[PDB]
Write a protein that binds this ligand. Structure first.
Ligand SMILES: [Mg+2]
Ligand SMILES: [Mg+2]
Ligand SMILES: [Mg+2]
Lengths: 394, 311, 424
């Protein structure tokens, strides 16, 4: 998104459709090399503490597509918008709305014309594909094939036996001490070839491998299955009363008003209070392991704070395996050391900061000649292009 | 044909509105989404002077010469300019269209906001920066527009080159025919001499083509009159140069020694005391901008510029 | 990558130059990141396996969960050229060659039929559309079983081991240069020197395959210069007298146009399209000191040319969509490239005859030659015979100098584009 006329057109529609918010990207929590984790629960909550945020929420992150529900008083009038600034116009409107009336009946609607509500639409199926490519099933198969050979085969067995041979064993012990220059002097060219190769052959943990290989097929059976839309709402962003008067809710505790799921709410005051309450909190998220769940997110109780991020995601080991591939655990030290959320976190922060300014524009005033709205959007869009260049696995 | 050789010109967009009407906020989105556009803004020129708002008549007058110098420099470069209107008062708004209409297809966008939504973002603005606009100065502006809004359509007004038709002063044709020629930089190429210390002018070079105009004009009824802004003190290195090149002439007029006024106004004074009423000037040959402007604009005579002035 | 070589030949392993007794039949060599293991499973079966660690066949820079290492045709190219190099020898050399340890020749031993099974192969391309594999058409021992999307298992069969190995290698090199691998595609500047002979080491390979390889895998005109003789020779022993050229057909075309017309007269560009011919005459080296006239009957070009105009065309263009708006009366050179066949023949005659009426110096008309379409895989299409009769019909009485020539690769004297240069 950098051609001027397409942006110009994109923004025009955002205005016409009366969109009044725009989701942020969410960073993983900081890694903890210390704890051997690439997105660390600990390091995520601690980050919040040291930045002066001590009242925080930990909701459960669900596998679904993000949508902002524009929940009008008259419920027929309700629409949805996406992760980007797009009215979700396809999809069955009666199927949606029925799924939406559970929620709608949790509120009193006296002189309240509209509530804007952050929600996940379920499953990823209904909306986008999200994690399914025409080339995701391909990755998944290639590894399956490679395993169902390696189990059926002479190969591993033979190799392990060469690895016991006295000829080989001495050589390998010499190669620790000799300077290649030196072992070219001692061993013949073809011995160096054969024996270094068999030494450096990557053996695979074939059970742990094959098991990971179907963490991947579970994801592919959900996608291509029958599903009716189904919402899990998690934040009230803003209420438009019928006066014209708006309430910028700014409380991630509005979750409980609209979601009966379990979640965590903590008051810390002092950092070694946190240090003390942590092991319980870990014990709790440790339970967030189901097929439903990407993992958990850490949001601060106040939904918007200056310079603070909207949340930290902390994805559980199984979902990470889908993101990173079947060799993940086997490549963990590598991947952890390569991980860098700085800059994902900077966009996560700016994005949320824009949204606040967008939300602050009155619903009343949303329109094709609100050039402060249009500016705030172009702002967001530019920063969409910036953040799109980051590590795709964040 | 002519119908199909058509030329295109830079756009100037003028933003007409009360303070608070979202003039800026539009330009910010405009110059980011449209393509060949630069903004000019008066307040920013103020900030350069470290004043926050409305300053001395001194600064303010000068800032205008800057704004106009800037809008035009940009416009000449085939670059589009977006600028805030200076007011809403019809005649300054007209003054703008005069100034810039030689140069661009003008267009207008009006920011017509109701009086109290104009205060409700002027008092949410005036919490932002230091500035302030009362509920007086906003309304001289809001209604001022509603009146000049009524007696002028903010219609696009395509580039106007108005060709002041070249009309010369009316001369008594019975008088003798004559041509008038400058010395310094015209018939005499001073060539590294001091402009003002003309004591060594007998070793200047001859602008050969001008000479061949005087040498041709005197081959007819034309009297060849030389009018130099050189001091009369230096009159004898001067008619030393002239004879040297057989540039015979009927009349050499020179600047009073120790005069020192701008060389146009002494030449104009020279022209009226010594040439007008006594000659018929066919055309004049001068070099210096200031002086050719004098001849052409103040006295309406034909003046052929020989080389570049602007000094 | 998993390769299984099958043959009930008794001396199969000897032909692979792999010995079943050394280290349990195992033959190991690192290949990139990167272990390639050969496995004498029997006297009648060899299993090549590739175990990567990371990023051996797709750059880390892309963000894909990455699987090229398990299926890319390149790994196959590599397996061949490490493990089976002698199997990829020149056709003649190979057969009259001795096998060590047997006092017999390959022509004496490689005489049992052979089967290579590729467990998984990536073919992201037009040549693998709807379970249909392009080379299956031209090589019928090619046997595809789709897996998913852009992936399939292969089965390759031959009289010889040599025939099968050399066919598997042909599959790899063609699948690799037709494949699209993403933003990080890239064909190395040593690829063409390495694998070019593959195309010549099995018989009855179609011309268009060589076309692709030159166009997609050869990077310089002098890398090309050394492979051209090799190719021409190959087709000479298949009946066909082919003359390959490096450049695209379009562009051999453009080079020609610019060469002949020169820079001396203003250009009249009929059917100017996206004006690629305009931006060429404006290479600064050329010093074009004239206006440049252009028509497209389609007034969608109309708005585009009329988008420059934006001050960008500085500024000798005059587009016109109405022929009554062209009044330039001085001589022009006039370009009629690949447009007389994007409308009616009767409509063609009308346009051409008009152009011959206009005040011109040189005109070049360009149309496809249909005798060439038979070597591949818009309104009408003419043979050179048809086309010369069209020009003869349009020139008639007049005293012009008309010269023909073909443009592009030349197969049995026929090229893909044909052209005339009409001269006053
Ligand atoms: Mg720490
Ligand atoms: Mg959630
Ligand atoms: Mg002068």
């Amino acid at each position: 998104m950098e051609d001027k006329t397409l942006i110009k057109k994109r923004i025009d529609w955002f205005c016409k459709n009366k969109i009044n918010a725009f989701s942020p990207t969410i960073s993983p929590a900081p890694k903890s090399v210390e704890r051997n984790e690439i997105e660390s629960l600990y390091e995520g909550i601690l980050w919040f503490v040291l930045n002066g945020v001590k009242e925080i929420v930990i909701e459960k992150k669900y596998m679904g597509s993000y949508c902002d529900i524009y929940l009008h008083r008259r419920l027929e009038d309700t629409y949805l918008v996406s992760r980007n600034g797009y009215k979700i116009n396809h999809l069955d409107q009666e199927q949606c709305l029925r799924a939406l009336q559970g929620l709608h009946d949790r509120f009193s609607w006296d002189g309240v014309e509209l509530r804007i509500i952050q929600s996940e639409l379920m499953p990823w199926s209904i909306l986008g594909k999200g994690l399914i490519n025409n080339e995701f099933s391909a990755y998944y198969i290639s590894h399956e094939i490679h395993a169902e050979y390696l189990v059926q085969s002479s190969l591993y067995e033979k190799l392990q036996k060469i690895q016991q041979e006295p000829a080989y064993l001495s050589f390998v012990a010499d190669a620790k001490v000799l300077s290649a220059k030196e072992l070219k002097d001692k061993y013949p060219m073809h011995i160096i070839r054969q024996y270094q190769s068999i030494r450096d052959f990557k053996f695979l943990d074939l059970p742990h491998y094959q098991q990971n290989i179907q963490l991947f097929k579970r994801q592919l059976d959900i996608f291509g299955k029958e599903a009716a839309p189904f919402f899990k709402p998690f934040n009230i962003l803003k209420e438009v009363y019928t006066d014209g008067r708006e309430h910028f809710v700014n409380d991630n505790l509005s979750f409980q008003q609209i979601n009966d799921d379990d979640f965590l709410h903590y008051q810390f005051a002092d950092r070694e209070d946190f240090e003390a309450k942590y092991p319980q909190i870990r014990a709790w998220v440790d339970q967030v392991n189901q097929s439903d769940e990407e993992g958990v997110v850490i949001k601060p109780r106040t939904a918007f704070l200056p310079g603070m991020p909207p949340a930290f995601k902390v994805r559980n080991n199984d979902y990470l395996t889908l993101v990173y591939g079947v060799d993940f655990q086997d490549r963990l030290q590598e991947q952890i050391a390569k991980r860098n959320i700085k800059g994902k976190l900077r966009c996560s922060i700016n994005d949320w900061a824009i949204n606040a300014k967008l939300l602050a524009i009155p619903y009343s005033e949303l329109g094709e000649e609100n050039y402060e709205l249009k500016n705030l959007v172009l702002d967001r869009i530019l920063g969409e292009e910036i953040e799109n260049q980051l590590d795709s696995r964040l | 044909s002519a119908k199909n050789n058509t030329h295109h010109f830079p756009k100037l967009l003028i933003l007409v509105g009360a303070p608070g009407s979202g003039k800026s906020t539009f330009a910010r989105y405009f110059i980011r989404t449209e393509d060949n556009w630069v903004r000019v803004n008066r307040d920013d020129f103020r900030l350069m002077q470290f004043g926050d708002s409305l300053m001395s008549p001194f600064y303010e007058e000068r800032i205008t010469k800057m704004v106009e110098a800037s809008v035009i420099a940009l416009l000449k470069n085939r670059t589009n300019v977006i600028i805030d209107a200076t007011n809403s008062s019809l005649r300054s708004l007209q003054d703008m269209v005069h100034t810039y209409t030689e140069y661009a297809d003008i267009s207008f966008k009006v920011f017509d906001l109701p009086v109290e939504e104009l205060v409700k973002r002027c008092d949410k603005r005036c919490e932002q920066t230091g500035k302030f606009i009362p509920k007086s100065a906003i309304e001289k502006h809001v209604t001022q527009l509603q009146y000049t809004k009524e007696k002028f359509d903010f219609k696009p007004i395509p580039r106007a080159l108005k060709e002041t038709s070249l009309t010369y002063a009316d001369q008594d044709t019975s008088l003798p025919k004559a041509v008038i020629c400058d010395l310094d930089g015209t018939l005499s190429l001073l060539n590294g001499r001091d402009p003002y210390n003309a004591s060594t002018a007998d070793q200047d070079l001859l602008n050969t083509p001008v000479a061949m105009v005087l040498k041709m004009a005197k081959q007819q009824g034309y009297k060849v009159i030389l009018l130099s802004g050189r001091e009369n003190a230096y009159r004898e290195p001067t008619e030393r140069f002239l004879a040297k090149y057989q540039i015979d002439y009927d009349l050499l007029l020179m600047r009073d020694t120790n005069d020192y006024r701008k060389d146009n106004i002494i030449k104009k004074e020279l022209f009226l005391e010594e040439i007008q009423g006594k000659y018929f000037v066919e055309f004049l040959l001068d070099d210096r901008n200031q002086v050719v402007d004098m001849w052409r604009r103040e006295l309406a005579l034909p003046c052929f510029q020989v080389n570049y002035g602007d000094f | 990558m998993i390769l299984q070589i099958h043959s009930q030949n008794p001396h199969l392993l000897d032909l692979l130059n792999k010995n079943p007794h050394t280290d349990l039949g195992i033959y190991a060599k690192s290949l990139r990141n990167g272990q390639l293991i050969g496995n004498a499973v029997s006297a009648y079966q060899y299993d090549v396996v590739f175990q990567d660690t990371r990023y051996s066949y797709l750059p880390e820079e892309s963000n894909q969960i990455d699987f090229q290492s398990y299926c890319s045709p390149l790994v196959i190219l590599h397996i061949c050229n490490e493990f089976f190099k002698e199997l990829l020898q020149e056709k003649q050399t190979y057969w009259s060659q001795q096998i060590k340890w047997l006092e017999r020749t390959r022509a004496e031993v490689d005489t049992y039929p052979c089967t290579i099974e590729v467990k998984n192969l990536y073919a992201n391309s037009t040549w693998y559309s709807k379970g249909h594999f392009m080379m299956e058409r031209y090589f019928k021992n090619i046997h595809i079983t789709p897996i998913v999307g852009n992936n399939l298992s292969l089965r390759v069969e031959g009289k010889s081991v040599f025939e099968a190995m050399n066919l598997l290698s042909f599959i790899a090199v063609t699948t690799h240069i037709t494949n699209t691998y993403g933003e990080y595609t890239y064909i190395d500047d040593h690829f063409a020197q390495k694998y070019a002979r593959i195309l010549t080491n099995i018989p009855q390979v179609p011309y268009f395959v060589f076309y692709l390889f030159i166009k997609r895998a050869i990077k310089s005109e002098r890398q090309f210069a050394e492979i051209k003789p090799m190719f021409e020779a190959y087709f000479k022993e298949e009946g066909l007298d082919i003359d390959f050229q490096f450049t695209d057909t379009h562009g051999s075309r453009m080079d020609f146009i610019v060469k002949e017309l020169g820079m001396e007269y203003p250009i009249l560009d009929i059917g100017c399209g996206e004006l690629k011919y305009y931006r060429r005459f404006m290479r600064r080296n050329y010093n074009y000191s004239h206006p440049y006239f252009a028509t497209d009957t389609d007034k969608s070009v109309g708005d585009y040319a009329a988008l420059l105009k934006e001050r960008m065309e500085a500024d000798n263009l005059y587009f016109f969509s109405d022929w009554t708006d062209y009044e330039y009366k001085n001589p022009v050179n006039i370009i009629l490239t690949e447009v007389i066949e994007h409308n009616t023949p009767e409509a063609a005659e009308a346009l051409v005859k008009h152009c011959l009426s206009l005040n011109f110096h040189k005109m070049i008309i360009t149309t496809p030659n249909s005798l060439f379409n038979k070597y591949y895989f818009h309104h009408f299409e003419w043979t050179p015979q048809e086309f010369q009769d069209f020009i003869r019909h349009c020139v008639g009485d007049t005293s012009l100098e008309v010269t023909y020539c073909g443009i592009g690769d030349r197969i049995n004297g026929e090229t893909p584009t044909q052209a005339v240069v009409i001269t006053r």
